[model samples]
Target: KPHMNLVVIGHVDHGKSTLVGHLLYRLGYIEEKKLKELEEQAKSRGKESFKFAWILDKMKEERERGITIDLTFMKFETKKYVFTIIDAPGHRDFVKNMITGASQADAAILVVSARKGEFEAGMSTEGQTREHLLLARTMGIEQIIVAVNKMDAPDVNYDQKRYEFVVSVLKKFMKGLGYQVDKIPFIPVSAWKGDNLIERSPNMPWYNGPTLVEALDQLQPPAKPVDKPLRIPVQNVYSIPGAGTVPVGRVETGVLRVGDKVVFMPPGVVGEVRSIEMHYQQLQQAEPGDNIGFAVRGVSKSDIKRGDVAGHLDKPPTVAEEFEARIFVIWHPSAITVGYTPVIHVHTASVSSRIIEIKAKLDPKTGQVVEQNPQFLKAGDAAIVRFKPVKPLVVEKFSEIPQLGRFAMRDMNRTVGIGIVTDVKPAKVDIK
Candidate 1:
């Protein structure tokens, strides 16, 4: 079976965690003994409803390394696909985590509630469901499966009309956000009761299409880009007791292997991978999208920093003095001037970059230039522009490595603009 990285996203109380818990249980990932044991603990603490959701919260303390895996992630398998489920808790401030998860995801499951008022409450103006949906589109998740959960609720009663109502509204909203509504699935599931999960329950006779597990098998997997150059945008560098200098991050593209020499951009420090660890288990090599901590051989803690990228020597991560981009102004207080500076969020890096030049304003739908040498750009204007980072930064052309290419502009903690790197003026630096 081919492997893919997936994000499970939804509202805070949508019972998405319970969905994941029960899904894992039926897949034989969570065993019988511990299953009922958790239930009794929940019963002792409160009631039957507390059983599934709280266990994962309990599993959050440390890497249990057994039934529970790493923080907010687990291995999932079906007939033709193996998936790394990044269980992103959809809360208000959890957008940061969801962005990171979406950065790693090839596809996603949008777990929505269908329990009457719960559903309405979740799709309101400031709901996590809306944020998750918008973020998923902005961050470039190509596919999604909308799980209309809580169908077993008294008001819902697995009603076919209720399911249709949920789907109709969602389809309209998602279409407005530029989603491919026709292809996307609206799955009716009682996540707690296990209806239409792995096996379809007779409780919903009118529901059509495959089960949740079945959908996993049918959805396409992304290509493994291991053959490309290694690019791990450093999250942070750590100094452990045994491991000398460890730079931890997710592999955006390519592979990192034990004994392989690597180079960090911006700082331009060369290093070797002594070993790599994911949740304390040492691995010989890491593939793209793997969150890992690699022990260093040549670099120091001060030499390599977060926002720097590590890659193979032949095709090192490009450091830019200034770069070209086509940015769509999503929102801003006023018109963006040439000297406007904002925090540009790209990969694991965020740097204050100034918009040095606004060449031409392009029509959002048609790529044709609406105005040449536009004086200023306001909200909803799409334009080609040049940026100079206040300091050195690693960036790639969106055409080549989209992981490092796509970025969002933030000012006052708001995503005011989104763009992709069009070109770069590389600033050469020493490999050592």
Candidate 2:
């Protein structure tokens, strides 16, 4: 069966975790013992304060604070496909986790609370939602489904006026960001009641739209030609007693076959594929996203480290000290000032870079330039900027190879932004 990785995201308290819990419950994947244990723990704590949402916020601090502190992966299968759903956090501090989770998804679902008015002052976290959608789109998720949640806010019903208003506003917002809302699907749902999730909702008789499950089941998997150049970023390197060094990584794109000649970047080590193993079994070939290890007889353990890309000589990965990327600052204690050098984590690589130019800061909500040539950027802001990396690194253009095109901005161990490689041409500058 085909495999699909989906990330569910939205503003804080938009029912992302509850929706995932309901999905797992409806699918009967929640183990009986685990459910009983959770219930027991909840009862032990208190009767009135207990919420099944804690099943996901398993951490003590997370359950107490009522936030998703870490990324959670849950796998389930339907008749058509096998799905790995990433329930990402929506809190301000967890934006890094969200970016990491979204980077791997094949598609995404944005849960919006319909009861919260778009015009209502702080009725919802629309700002964060807008940033998440913008970042998700830039991360290469084209097929988006906006699940308008909280239909049962006042009653177990969906108000057509409110639904249309929210949908219209969201449609305009996404359209401004170059997303075709006419082609995207928006389903009104009540995640609390499991309404319109996996099945049609009986609460709203006037609604005649396919349920969320039906819509998701109809999604088509991405189809990229296998003839594209191969790129695999080394995540780690290990040594065996007699077999020499083994490089472990996930193939980002294309195919890697045994006996094929490959080159590692930055370190500039050339080697032939000795053997490939996935979870201890020998494999003839590895495709995109396969976490496998390769035994190389020629390369020394000292020669290779993390953040290196391997590919053929004809289409060697682009290594550069500078390039232009479209970035979204999700969370920052303060604005990203000029000359601010933050560590950029790209794929399995991390490099520090200074903010040389803030070409434009675009309002993610409206997709308009709010600040042109601004010296700094605040949190929840998207911008098109040109910056130079502190060290030489391999990067692929988003159009050329998307798997290697996305990156995350980090400062002091926290992710501050996510960027896409719109341009990978090397920048010429004096380093002396």
Candidate 3:
């Protein structure tokens, strides 16, 4: 079966955790003993209504605070696909964690409440629903499934009119955000009551659509870019008890095999692959999406670190000094001026970079150039800008190698913008 990464996101108190937790329970992924234990814990806390949310809130503080503050990952198998679900936090303070989670997802599920006034409140200027969707879009998640939850609430009463209203509003907004209305699936569900989740609900006679599980099954898995040049961003390096130095990461593109000569950029370490292993199983070759550890014949433990990109020597990764990118500011507290330095996150690499120039500002809604050399960029601004990295970094053009093309800008411990590389000036480096 194909493997897929799916992320769930929405505004706070919109039932994301409940929906995900209940889905796991209905699919038989949650053990009965664990479920019973969670139930008793919830009752003791006088939060019996939150039994389902307890499944992913494994942290004590998360359960006590009644909010997810970080990303929770779980794996489960569907009929058509094996899924790695990333349950992202919805609280405003956790938006940075949400960005990190969403950046790794291939698709998304956006939850909205059907309870009277709740949906409206979440769509307001101060709400995070719009911000979440825009962030998902900017991060390159194209497929989305919208779940209108809480239909069983007393205020909603499973009313078909309310369902239609929510769907209509979402259709307009999703379209404005560049989503195809015909392609997006909208499902009405009551996660708390287990209605329209695992199966179609008999209570909604007017509605005819697939349940949440069925919608997930219908989503197409992203195609692997194995035909491109090899690129594996190193996640970590380790020295096992007996095994030699090993660098581990998921192969983002192309194929890697034993005996192949590889070059790691930024660090510029060159070595021949001696062996490869995934889950302790010896392998002759590893392809895209395979998280594997490999021993390099001559590379030392301290030579390459997490930020290095391993690739074929002939098609080595590019170390960039300066690059041009199309950036969308998501949460800049004030105007962004030239010479502002921030940490740029691409793949597993985080390097401090300076905004050398603001070439032009573009209208995010229309993609049209609005101003040349804009003095400063505020929140909601989109621009083509150039950056100068403080150190050597591997970056690829978005159109040519998308796996290493997109990046996030972090300032003051928060993700303030996201961008895609449009151009690059390769650094002159020789790997002998």
User: Global lDDT of each model?
Assistant: 0.82, 0.75, 0.85
Error of 3 at 320 (Å): 3.4
What TM-score fits each model?
0.84, 0.72, 0.81
Ranked by TM-score, the better of candidates 1 and 2 is 1
TM-score (C-alpha, index-matched) for candidate 2: 0.72
Model 1 per-residue lDDT at 244: 92
Give the better candidate number (1 or 3) by TM-score. Answer: 1
The best-first sequence of candidates by lDDT reads 3, 1, 2
Candidate 3 per-residue lDDT, tens place, 117-198, comes to 8898777665667768877887778989999999999999889999999899888888987899888788999988888888
Highest TM-score: give the candidate number: 1
Give Cα distance to truth, residue 116, candidate 3, Å: 3.7
lDDT of 1 by residue, 353-424 (tens): 999999999988888998988899999899999999998988999888988888877787456788999999
lDDT string, candidate 2, 40-63, tens digits: 877777442334466677776777
Worst ten in a row by lDDT for model 2: 117-126
Number of backbone collisions per candidate, in order? 0, 0, 0
- In Å, residue 132's CA in model 2 sits off its true spot by 0.6
